[PDB]
Amino acid sequence: TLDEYRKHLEKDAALERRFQPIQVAEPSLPHTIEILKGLRDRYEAHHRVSITDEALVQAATLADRYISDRFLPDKAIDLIDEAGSRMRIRR
Amino acid sequence: SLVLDQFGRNLTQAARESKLDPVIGREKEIERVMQVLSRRTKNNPVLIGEPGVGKTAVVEGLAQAIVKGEVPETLKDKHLYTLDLGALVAGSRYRGDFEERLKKVLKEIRTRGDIILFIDALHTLVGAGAAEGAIDAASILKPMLARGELQTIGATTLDEYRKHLEKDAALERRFQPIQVAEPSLPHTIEILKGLRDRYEAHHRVSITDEALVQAATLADRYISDRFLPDKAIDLIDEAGSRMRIRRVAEVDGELIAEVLATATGIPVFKLTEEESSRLLRMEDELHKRVIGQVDAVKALSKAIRRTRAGLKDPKRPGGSFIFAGPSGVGKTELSKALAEFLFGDEDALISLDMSEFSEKHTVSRLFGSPPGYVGYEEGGQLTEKVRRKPFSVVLFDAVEKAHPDIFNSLLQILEDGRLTDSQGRVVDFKNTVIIMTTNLGTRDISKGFNLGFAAQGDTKSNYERMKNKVSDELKQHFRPEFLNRVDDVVVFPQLSQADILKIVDLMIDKVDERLKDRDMGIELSSSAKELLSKKGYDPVLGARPLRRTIQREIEDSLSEKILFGELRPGHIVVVDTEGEGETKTFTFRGEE
Numbered sequence: 001t002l003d004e005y006r007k008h009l010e011k012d013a014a015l016e017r018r019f020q021p022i023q024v025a026e027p028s029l030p031h032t033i034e035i036l037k038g039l040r041d042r043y044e045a046h047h048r049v050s051i052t053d054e055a056l057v058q059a060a061t062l063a064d065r066y067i068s069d070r071f072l073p074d075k076a077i078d079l080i081d082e083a084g085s086r087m088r089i090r091r
Numbered sequence: 092s093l094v095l096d097q098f099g100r101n102l103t104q105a106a107r108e109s110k111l112d113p114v115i116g117r118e119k120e121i122e123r124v125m126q127v128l129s130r131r132t133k134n135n136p137v138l139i140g141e142p143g144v145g146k147t148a149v150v151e152g153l154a155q156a157i158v159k160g161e162v163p164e165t166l167k168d169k170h171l172y173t174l175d176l177g178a179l180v181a182g183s184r185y186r187g188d189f190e191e192r193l194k195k196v197l198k199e200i201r202t203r204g205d206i207i208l209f210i211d212a213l214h215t216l217v218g219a220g221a222a223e224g225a226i227d228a229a230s231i232l233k234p235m236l237a238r239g240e241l242q243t244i245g246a247t248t249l250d251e252y253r254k255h256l257e258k259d260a261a262l263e264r265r266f267q268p269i270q271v272a273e274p275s276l277p278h279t280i281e282i283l284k285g286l287r288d289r290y291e292a293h294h295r296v297s298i299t300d301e302a303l304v305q306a307a308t309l310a311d312r313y314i315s316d317r318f319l320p321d322k323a324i325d326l327i328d329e330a331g332s333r334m335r336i337r338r339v340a341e342v343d344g345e346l347i348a349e350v351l352a353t354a355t356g357i358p359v360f361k362l363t364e365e366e367s368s369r370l371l372r373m374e375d376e377l378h379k380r381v382i383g384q385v386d387a388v389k390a391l392s393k394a395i396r397r398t399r400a401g402l403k404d405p406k407r408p409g410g411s412f413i414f415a416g417p418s419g420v421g422k423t424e425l426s427k428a429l430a431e432f433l434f435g436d437e438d439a440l441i442s443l444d445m446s447e448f449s450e451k452h453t454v455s456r457l458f459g460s461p462p463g464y465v466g467y468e469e470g471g472q473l474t475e476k477v478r479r480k481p482f483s484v485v486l487f488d489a490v491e492k493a494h495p496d497i498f499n500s501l502l503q504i505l506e507d508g509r510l511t512d513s514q515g516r517v518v519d520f521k522n523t524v525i526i527m528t529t530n531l532g533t534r535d536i537s538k539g540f541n542l543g544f545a546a547q548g549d550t551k552s553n554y555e556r557m558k559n560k561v562s563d564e565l566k567q568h569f570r571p572e573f574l575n576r577v578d579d580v581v582v583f584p585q586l587s588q589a590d591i592l593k594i595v596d597l598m599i600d601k602v603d604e605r606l607k608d609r610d611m612g613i614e615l616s617s618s619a620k621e622l623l624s625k626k627g628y629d630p631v632l633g634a635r636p637l638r639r640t641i642q643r644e645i646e647d648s649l650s651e652k653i654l655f656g657e658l659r660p661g662h663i664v665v666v667d668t669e670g671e672g673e674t675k676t677f678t679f680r681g682e683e
């Protein structure tokens with residue numbers, strides 16, 4: 001992470017010199033929707049439920065808009081996982 | 092030499108096999124190293140220097156000179172062995188195992204007198220042995236080093252030399268330090284020319300002289316946290332790897348520029364026709380979001396074009412602007428539009444709300460706490476953001492509402508393009524665009540005349556009077572040295588009726604997007620737009636009263652209709668006007 005890179009890895013300049021940093025940026029909304037579409041199969045298999053495309057779009061949009069403490073790819077998956085668990089316990 | 096080969100590596104043998112890269116232009120350092128080595132009492136040189144300047148390269152060049160070429164007497168046919176110091180510690184569980192290995196190595200070295208030791212990372216020599224019953228390597232080596240019975244070479248950086256070697260003054264006094272300075276630009280060019288053959292052979296490509304020159308110049312100018320030889324070598328190697336993977340292959344300037352731009356994000360790649368055409372139409376692209384304010388758009392476009400054309404001063408930021416004007420005219424909207432045009436959206440802007448910097452002791456939020464104070468390790472807040480994104484737009488909103496001392500910290504930003512945090516690190520600002528927004532000298536826009544008798548009247552429009560007032564207030568509020576560093580001061584005139592009529596379309600489009608979020612839509616007639624423009628228009632308060640009027644006259648009715656149930660998904664609403672004169676009102680009709 002950026003904080004760990006600055007706080008710890010930069011205290012040893014000789015070790016930090018031997019690495020080439022690469023920036024991994026937070027994905028945009030369409031990229032998050034594609035990721036959710038990709039992981040829908042695995043999450044449906046684990047939770048024994050079915051997820052609609054509208055559910056993925058709503059999860060991505062709502063996570064991007066309202067939840068502001070984390071970053072997009074994870075907080076969108078969290079809503080889907082929580083919904084799956086809530087639906088599973090109801091049986 | 093079996094015991095030496097078990098816990099070390101023969102550098103001279105490797106140099107005889109051409110397994111070491113050539114060393115260019117280090118004659119003075121090698122000469123001084125040999126001169127120190129051929130001493131009588133303390134012949135132990137240590138090379139201290141910044142990481143990546145070529146400290147190990149000096150030792151490798153000395154080994155190559157010993158193997159082939161001319162070296163002074165007492166150094167003819169000497170074997171230079173690198174002591175890894177990691178194998179000695181390994182496998183020494185029982186008491187007196189590290190000491191036995193060290194004593195055996197020293198005895199072999201004394202027996203075979205043509206041996207010179209090299210110990211990379213000399214700071215690790217302190218406390219080599221573990222706790223309990225053990226004698227560390229430094230204390231064992233001290234007597235031989237003091238008397239000159241063991242020629243050795245060390246290499247460290249300044250940080251751990253001052254941090255570890257200087258703690259043990261007794262061991263520190265036995266070594267003669269030699270400074271290794273970072274090479275200049277022509278020396279780096281010569282080094283690149285020397286290593287070109289090896290890198291071309293490894294990557295099976297061809298590298299031009301212009302490629303080396305461009306790599307050296309760009310690495311010197313744009314990369315900040317590294318040092319010149321390593322930066323240039325990394326650029327050349329990565330460009331060669333990229334071209335090899337793409338597949339005679341040839342590496343030239345544009346590939347180096349593209350690699351650097353991809354690595355850092357600063358736009359330095361070669362200009363194409365499409366990008367040039369896009370840059371020549373920057374004003375038209377920006378006007379899609381900002382109505383009016385032609386002068387500010389021209390200034391911003393000129394600054395961006397000058398930056399991209401290659402005529403920017405390489406020691407100052409790309410541009411510095413003071414946007415002064417009344418409320419609700421588009422000062423922040425223009426900055427957001429510029430950010431969206433530049434990177435991908437208004438979310439990439441670096442915005443500071445100067446209303447929080449009311450007290451002069453808040454300036455630490457730009458630098459960080461000094462050493463020995465809470466929050467010292469966290470560093471600065473602006474410095475970190477700029478360092479993690481060298482090419483960005485920095486905005487200071489409502490500059491007049493902060494204490495008139497925080498901006499004393501902007502001087503070095505606006506003239507030298509740099510800022511130092513409390514930890515001593517320098518973060519450059521040479522690729523940023525600085526915008527400072529204010530409404531100073533705009534309190535008298537709704538003024539008719541001045542006190543006292545006067546014949547005829549002021550023929551100057553509001554723009555000229557407001558410009559003079561802004562200039563006077565700016566000179567009154569800021570120091571002359573701060574205003575002498577600002578590239579441009581742009582005054583924003585008020586909006587006219589046509590500007591409001593045009594902004595109505597953008598606001599209606601935003602409302603339409605909000606409605607379409609729920610699968611709906613809204614369409615207005617020309618009469619509706621004209622009525623909305625007429626109802627909300629105040630020359631003093633800008634385009635915010637238009638927003639309030641739009642919300643009151645449209646959104647309340649739309650919410651009432653949606654909650655009731657008349658408007659449902661799959662339907663669109665059409666807004667028209669009824670009545671005449673001052674009794675004209677709006678009518679909403681549903682439609683599929």
Ligand SMILES: Nc1ncnc2c1ncn2[C@@H]1O[C@H](COP(=O)(O)OP(=O)(O)OP(=O)(O)O)[C@@H](O)[C@H]1O
Binds near residue numbers: 381384420424425
């Ligand atoms: N020239 C303009 N073109 C388009 N929209 C505008 C323009 N001026 C103002 N607006 C609208 O009015 C809103 C408020 O204006 P804005 O935030 O740009 O004001 P400002 O000039 O920064 O003033 P303040 O001194 O109040 O900060 C904008 O978000 C935009 O919707």
Ligand SMILES: Nc1ncnc2c1ncn2[C@@H]1O[C@H](COP(=O)(O)OP(=O)(O)O)[C@@H](O)[C@H]1O
Binds near residue numbers: 143146
């Ligand atoms: N004088 C020089 N001639 C050729 N190459 C050099 C020279 N100095 C440094 N280099 C190159 O710089 C690279 C890294 O240098 P390095 O030996 O790691 O320095 P340090 O040991 O101080 O970190 C090496 O691969 C080397 O090829």
Ligand SMILES: [Mg+2]
Binds near residue numbers: 422423488528
């Ligand atoms: Mg504003």
